Amino acid sequence: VNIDTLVTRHSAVLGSTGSGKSTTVTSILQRISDMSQFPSARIIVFDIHGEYAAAFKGKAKVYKVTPSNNELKLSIPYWALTCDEFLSVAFGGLEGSGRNALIDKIYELKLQTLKRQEYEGINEDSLTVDTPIPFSIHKLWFDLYRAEISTHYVQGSHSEENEALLLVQKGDSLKVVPPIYMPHTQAQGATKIYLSNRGKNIRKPLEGLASLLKDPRYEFLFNADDWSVNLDGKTNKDLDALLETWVGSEESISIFDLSGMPSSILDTLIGILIRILYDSLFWSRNQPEGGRERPLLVVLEEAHTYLGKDSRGIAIDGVRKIVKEGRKYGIGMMLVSQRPSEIDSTILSQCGTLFALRMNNSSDRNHVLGAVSDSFEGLMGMLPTLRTGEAIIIGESVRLPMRTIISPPPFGRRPDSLDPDVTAKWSNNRVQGDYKEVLTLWRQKKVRSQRIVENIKRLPVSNILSIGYEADSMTLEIEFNHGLVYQYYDVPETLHTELLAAESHGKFFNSQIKNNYRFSRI
Amino acid sequence: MTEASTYIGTVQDVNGANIRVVLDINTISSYRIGQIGSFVRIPIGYINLFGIVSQVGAGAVPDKLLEVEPYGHRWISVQLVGEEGI
Secondary structure, eight states: OOOOHHHTTEEEEEEOOGOOOOHHHHHHHHHHTTTTOTTTEEEEEOOOOOSSSOSSSSSEEESSSSSSSSSOOOOOOGSSSSHHHHHHHSSSSSOOOOHHHHHHHHHHHHHHHHHHOOTOOOOOOSTTTTTTOOOHHHHHHHHHHHHHHHHSSSSSSGGGBBOOOOOOOOOOOSSEEEEEEEBBBOOOOSOOOOSSSOOOSOOHHHHHHHHHHHOGHHHHHHHHSOOOOTTTTTTTSOOHHHHHHHHHSEEEEEEOOOOOOOTSSHHHHHHHHHHHHHHHHHHHSSSSTTTTTSBBBEEEEOGGGTTTTOSSSHHHHHHHHHHHHHHTTTTTOOOSSEEEEEEEEOHHTTSSEEOOOOOSHHHHHHHHHHTTTTOHHHHHHGGGOOTTTTEEEETTSSSSSEEEEOOOOOTTTOOOOOOOOHHHHHSOOOOOOOOHHHHHHHHHHHHHSOOOOSSOOOEEEHHHHOOETTTTOOOEEEEESOEEEEEEOOOOHHHHHHHHTTTSSSIIIIIIITTTTTOOOO | OOOOOOOOOOEESSSSSEEEEEEESSOOOOSSOOOOOOEEEEEETTTTHHHHEEETTTTTOOOHHHHHOOOOOOEEEEEEEEEEOO
8 A cells, every 4th residue: 555645645434333443543553653664753643532542552642631640731722822713712702892802902911921021033013913922811811800890999080000999809810819899889978989981891701711710621721731821921831842742752653632621622622733733834844843854644533523514613624724735735634434424525525545444324335435536346335244354445545446454453552442341330339438528529629539648659560560558548559450540548457468468469359359448549 | 629728618507697517627627727716708609708606516506416416516606797799
């Protein structure tokens, strides 16, 4: 199979849910990005269900939402977005004068940041809202929310120096706490206090933004680790580090695990990532770090949910732009789906190569037949009766349409999402629970309890890969495969001392310790 | 002889000032083929009718053709602008 046409002319993998397309994609990716043959590979995967991280144990970087043992943390700074995408993410697309007010505030904050911190090739003349310059969002929220509720001490003038605060609540910028102001009352006897006369109609959007800031689900957006913005507009790191970590690491394959992200903004975030990657690899097409000197491949999972015929999302525009223009700047594409009838025909028709697996219904088969350019009546009638793992390669990347059996991946590299098992949990004997603890966790909006041991030192060795314990806290720590780490609390020393001297590592654990002691997965 | 240079297709529907043309060039796609802002020339005996393309793709296919065959889109929609005199 030709590989230059496979990347430059795009591809597509279509099949049924029972056809095991994940194994085929994993095998293809492993074969293309071999270290021995292609030392300078470059692949980006937009994993959605997080079922590809397991297949690549130590062969690829993984950027999840919540790191546990060794995976990194995905983080997209909000100041790297454009104005429209930022509005669609935070405020949901305001259309009134509030949009103008927010744009003006963004411009003012960016100008102040440029004044404070020197930047190369950027001045007051060549600054746009589109320019990715860091700026504080908490300061903006504080200013706009105080300029809408707080009441001036003296009527007629509503300057900031006339703060009519009852004394108590000064308020914090980094925190979401707002300041308190005395109520407006111009009656006789007492002092005349008037509310702010410049307040816009953005109270509800600002409350929503405050809720989003206080929500822990948006840490990757508003609380980037190395790209958090102080009130003066300064960050620990820059965007170059992010770009290097994304498409410049020593590992050939980088996987984005978007399983834990909210379902209402996934399309927008995919569009954001696509736009950032395309711009970064387009504006530097002469340097050795550009796409022309090192072509990049993008693998998109479950393309039928975003590339529909009438989809109004942002990712569809980026996908169309890549499909139309990557042949020149060296950016490939590879759509994977289990429902070809949902993908846009104008997009599916431009894919150079098709990997047609077994398809069950007739709509998908008809769509595939209509979206093909090289058909042999002998082979195309075999689609509903293809063996699992067998593909029919068709397109410009092969001399002839041939029916292949994709080479299976090496042992210990079978993709499998860590979906909780129904049988094990449902068959276990029910035990007592801590209603107070779960209620407190729900009120706090945190996933880490208070009784978690910090730095237990473990030792090497259903399977058990490591074992740790402490005599001071009497809490047992057992590490399983797939990166799972458990922490059983209030265990006597006798149990784990006997376990360490047992014939094997297990069995007895399931016999006595598995379902008697309260635990907490970390 | 055959269709000479600068040939696109034939008229297949008239609604007064909304012409629908079926493309004949299979895979030329490169003077580029009719774009959105491009002009086309329709000679009638002696005079040339100049027109402007307005819709390209599924938007120009007649309603019943889509219901019959929704996988083939080789139609363009031309709106007449003016004519060249003598």
